Short mmCIF file of C-alpha atoms in Angstrom, two decimals:
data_model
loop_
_atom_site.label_atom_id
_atom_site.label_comp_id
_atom_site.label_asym_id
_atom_site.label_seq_id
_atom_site.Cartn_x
_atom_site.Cartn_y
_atom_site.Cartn_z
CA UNK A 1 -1.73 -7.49 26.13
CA UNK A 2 -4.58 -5.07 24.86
CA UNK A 3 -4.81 -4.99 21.00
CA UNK A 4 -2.55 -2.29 19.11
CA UNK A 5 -5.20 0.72 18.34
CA UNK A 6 -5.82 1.83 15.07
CA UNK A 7 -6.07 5.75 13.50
CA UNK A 8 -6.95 7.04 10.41
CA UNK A 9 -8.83 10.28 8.94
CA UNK A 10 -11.92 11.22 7.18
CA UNK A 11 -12.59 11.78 4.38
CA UNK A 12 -8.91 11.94 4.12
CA UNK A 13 -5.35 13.14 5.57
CA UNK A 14 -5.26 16.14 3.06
CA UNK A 15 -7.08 18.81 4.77
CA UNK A 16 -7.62 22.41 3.11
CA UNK A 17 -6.84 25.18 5.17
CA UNK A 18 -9.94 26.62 7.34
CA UNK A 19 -11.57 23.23 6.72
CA UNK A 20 -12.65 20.12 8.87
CA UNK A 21 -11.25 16.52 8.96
CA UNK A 22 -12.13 13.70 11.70
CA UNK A 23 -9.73 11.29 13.14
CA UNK A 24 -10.87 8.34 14.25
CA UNK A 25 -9.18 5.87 16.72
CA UNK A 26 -10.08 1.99 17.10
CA UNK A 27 -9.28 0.45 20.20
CA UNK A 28 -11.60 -2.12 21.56
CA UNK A 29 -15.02 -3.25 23.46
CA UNK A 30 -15.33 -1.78 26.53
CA UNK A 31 -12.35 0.80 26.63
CA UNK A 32 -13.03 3.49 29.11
CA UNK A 33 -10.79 6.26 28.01
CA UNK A 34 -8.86 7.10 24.44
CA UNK A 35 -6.18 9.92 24.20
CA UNK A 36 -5.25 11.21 20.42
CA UNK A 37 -1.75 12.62 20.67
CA UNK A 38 -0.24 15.50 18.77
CA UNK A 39 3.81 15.79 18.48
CA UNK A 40 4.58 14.56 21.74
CA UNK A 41 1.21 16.29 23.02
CA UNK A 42 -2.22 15.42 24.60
CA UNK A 43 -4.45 16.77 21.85
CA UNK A 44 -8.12 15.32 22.83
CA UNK A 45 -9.56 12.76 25.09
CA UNK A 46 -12.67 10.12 24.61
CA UNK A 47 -13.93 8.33 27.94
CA UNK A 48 -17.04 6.06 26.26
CA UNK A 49 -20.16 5.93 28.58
CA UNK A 50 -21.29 2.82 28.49
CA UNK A 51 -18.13 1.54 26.78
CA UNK A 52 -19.40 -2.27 26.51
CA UNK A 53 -20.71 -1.67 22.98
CA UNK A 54 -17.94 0.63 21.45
CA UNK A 55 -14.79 0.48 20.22
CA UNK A 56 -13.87 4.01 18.66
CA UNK A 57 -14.03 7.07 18.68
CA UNK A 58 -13.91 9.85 16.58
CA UNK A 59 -12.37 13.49 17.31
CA UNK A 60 -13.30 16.43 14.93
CA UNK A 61 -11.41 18.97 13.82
CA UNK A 62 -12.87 21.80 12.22
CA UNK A 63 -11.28 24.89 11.12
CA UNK A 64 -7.89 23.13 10.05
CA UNK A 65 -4.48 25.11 10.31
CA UNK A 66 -0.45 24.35 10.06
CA UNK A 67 -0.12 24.72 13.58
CA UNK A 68 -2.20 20.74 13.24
CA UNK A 69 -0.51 19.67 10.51
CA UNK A 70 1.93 16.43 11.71
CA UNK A 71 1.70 13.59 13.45
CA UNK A 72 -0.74 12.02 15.58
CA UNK A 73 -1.13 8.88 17.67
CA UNK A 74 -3.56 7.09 19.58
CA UNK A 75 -3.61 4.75 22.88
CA UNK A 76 -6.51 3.88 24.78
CA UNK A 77 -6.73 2.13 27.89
CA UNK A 78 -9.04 -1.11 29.74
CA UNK A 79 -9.28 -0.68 33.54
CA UNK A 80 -5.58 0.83 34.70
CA UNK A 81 -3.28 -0.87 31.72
CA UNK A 82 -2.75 1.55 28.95
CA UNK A 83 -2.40 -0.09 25.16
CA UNK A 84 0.38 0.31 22.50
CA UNK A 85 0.31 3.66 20.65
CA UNK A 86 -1.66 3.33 17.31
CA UNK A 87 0.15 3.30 14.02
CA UNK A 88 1.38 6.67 12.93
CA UNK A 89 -1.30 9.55 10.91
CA UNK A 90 -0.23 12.65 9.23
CA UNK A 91 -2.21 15.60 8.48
CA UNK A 92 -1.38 18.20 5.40
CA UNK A 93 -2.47 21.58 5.28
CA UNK A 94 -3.60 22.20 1.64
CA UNK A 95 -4.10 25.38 -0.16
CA UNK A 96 -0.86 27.44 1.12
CA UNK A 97 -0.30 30.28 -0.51
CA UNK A 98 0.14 29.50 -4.52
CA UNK A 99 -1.26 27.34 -7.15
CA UNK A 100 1.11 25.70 -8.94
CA UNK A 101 0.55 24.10 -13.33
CA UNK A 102 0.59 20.97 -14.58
CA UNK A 103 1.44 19.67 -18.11
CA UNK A 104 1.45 16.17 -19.25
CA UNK A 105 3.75 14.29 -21.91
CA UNK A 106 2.94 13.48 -24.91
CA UNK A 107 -0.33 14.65 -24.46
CA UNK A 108 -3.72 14.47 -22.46
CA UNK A 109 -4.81 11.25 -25.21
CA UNK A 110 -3.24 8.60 -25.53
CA UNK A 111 -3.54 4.68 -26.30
CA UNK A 112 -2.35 1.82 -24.03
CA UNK A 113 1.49 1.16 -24.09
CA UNK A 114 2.38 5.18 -24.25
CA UNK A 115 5.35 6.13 -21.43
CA UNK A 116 3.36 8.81 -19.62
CA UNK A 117 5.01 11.77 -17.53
CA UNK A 118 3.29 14.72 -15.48
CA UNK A 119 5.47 17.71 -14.78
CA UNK A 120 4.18 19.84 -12.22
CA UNK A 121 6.01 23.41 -11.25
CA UNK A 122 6.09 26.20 -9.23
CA UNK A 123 9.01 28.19 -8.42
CA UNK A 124 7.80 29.32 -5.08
CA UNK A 125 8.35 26.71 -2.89
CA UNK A 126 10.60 23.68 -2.28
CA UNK A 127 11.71 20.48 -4.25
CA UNK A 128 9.24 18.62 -2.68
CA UNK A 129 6.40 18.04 -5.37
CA UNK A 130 3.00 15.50 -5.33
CA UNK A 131 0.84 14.22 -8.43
CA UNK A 132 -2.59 12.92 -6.88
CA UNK A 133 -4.90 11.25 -8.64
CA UNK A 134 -8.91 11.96 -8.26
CA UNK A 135 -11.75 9.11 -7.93
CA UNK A 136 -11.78 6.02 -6.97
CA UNK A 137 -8.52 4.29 -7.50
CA UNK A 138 -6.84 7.09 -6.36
CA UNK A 139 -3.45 7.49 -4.71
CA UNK A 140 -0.54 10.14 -3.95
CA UNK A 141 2.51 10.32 -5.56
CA UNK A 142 5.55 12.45 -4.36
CA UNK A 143 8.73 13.63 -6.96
CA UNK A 144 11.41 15.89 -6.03
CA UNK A 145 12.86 18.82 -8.32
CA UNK A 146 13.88 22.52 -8.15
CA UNK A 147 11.09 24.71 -9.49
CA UNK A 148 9.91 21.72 -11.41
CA UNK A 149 9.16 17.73 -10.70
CA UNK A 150 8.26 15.29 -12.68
CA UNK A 151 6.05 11.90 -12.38
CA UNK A 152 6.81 9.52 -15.43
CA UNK A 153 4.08 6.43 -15.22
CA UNK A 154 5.79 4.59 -17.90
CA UNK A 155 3.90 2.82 -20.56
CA UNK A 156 0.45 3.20 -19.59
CA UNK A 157 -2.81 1.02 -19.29
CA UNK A 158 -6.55 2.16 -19.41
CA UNK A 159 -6.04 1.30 -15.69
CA UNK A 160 -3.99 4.93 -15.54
CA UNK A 161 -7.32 6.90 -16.89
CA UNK A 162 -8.35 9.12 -14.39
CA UNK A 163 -8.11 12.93 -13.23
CA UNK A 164 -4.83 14.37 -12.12
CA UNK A 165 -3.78 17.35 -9.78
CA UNK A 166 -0.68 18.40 -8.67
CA UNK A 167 0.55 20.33 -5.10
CA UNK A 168 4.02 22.17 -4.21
CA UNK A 169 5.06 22.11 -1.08
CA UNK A 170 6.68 24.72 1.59
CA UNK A 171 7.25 21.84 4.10
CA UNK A 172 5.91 18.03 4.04
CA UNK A 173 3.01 19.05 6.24
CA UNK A 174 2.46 22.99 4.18
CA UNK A 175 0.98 22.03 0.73
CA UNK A 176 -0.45 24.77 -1.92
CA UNK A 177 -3.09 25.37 -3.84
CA UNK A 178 -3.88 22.16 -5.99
CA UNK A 179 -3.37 22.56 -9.37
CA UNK A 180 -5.79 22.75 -12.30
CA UNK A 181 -6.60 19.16 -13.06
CA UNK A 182 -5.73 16.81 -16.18
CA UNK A 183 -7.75 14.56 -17.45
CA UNK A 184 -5.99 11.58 -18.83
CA UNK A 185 -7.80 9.37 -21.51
CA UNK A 186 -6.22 6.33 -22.28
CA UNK A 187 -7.76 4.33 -25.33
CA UNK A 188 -6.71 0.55 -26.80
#
């Protein structure tokens, strides 16, 4: 009946301890109220005025903590008929506690067609490990290990150049300290 909302976060879901991050919501034209929901809680609430020429809204979060790291939601509603819930967002905390290392196999140069693998470790936190990768074109990847995880990319392209960082975990929403980045150069 009312189109399916749609959430997402800015600049992005990973959000650094003490730092801000801004949710928005998209509902549609005209909507006079939007709720952003928090673990089976009311978190904020949005009532456009005049509503006729929007169709989000944005709530800010500054000063981010663990106790807002999960999963939010969003609904919004057109006269008395409330929509759909959004699709699901989750928020990490960054920058718990330690800072994990990361080494690369063979080595930080190498030429198209070279089976590439990251290791990250830290033996202060769970199995639950995460290679991102920095810039545009960039992406999370997760790998699961005690102490230490790795993240083989296979034979590689120029397409995998780029700057690499690697997090531990203490939960899936409590990351650490990112690690010191690699910079991978890929020649051929």
């Amino acid at each position: 009946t009312l189109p399916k909302p749609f959430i997402w976060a800015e600049p992005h879901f990973m959000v650094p301890k003490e730092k801000q991050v801004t949710i928005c919501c998209q509902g549609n034209y005209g909507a006079v109220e939007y709720q952003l929901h928090f673990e089976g809680s009311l978190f904020a609430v949005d009532r456009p005025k005049p509503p006729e020429r929007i169709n989000k809204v944005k709530f800010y979060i500054p000063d981010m903590n663990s106790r807002m790291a999960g999963q939010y939601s969003c609904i919004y509603r057109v006269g008395e008929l409330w929509s759909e819930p959004s699709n699901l967002l989750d928020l990490v905390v960054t920058e718990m506690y330690d800072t994990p290392t990361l080494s690369v196999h063979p080595g930080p140069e190498v030429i198209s067609g070279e089976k590439v693998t990251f290791y990250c470790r830290l033996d202060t936190a769970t199995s639950m490990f995460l290679l991102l990768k920095e810039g545009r074109s960039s992406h999370v990847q997760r790998g699961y290990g005690k102490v230490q995880a790795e993240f083989p990319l296979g034979p590689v392209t120029t397409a995998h150049r780029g700057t690499y960082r690697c997090f531990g975990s203490y939960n899936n929403h409590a990351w650490s300290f990112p690690s010191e980045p690699v910079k991978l150069l890929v020649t051929g």
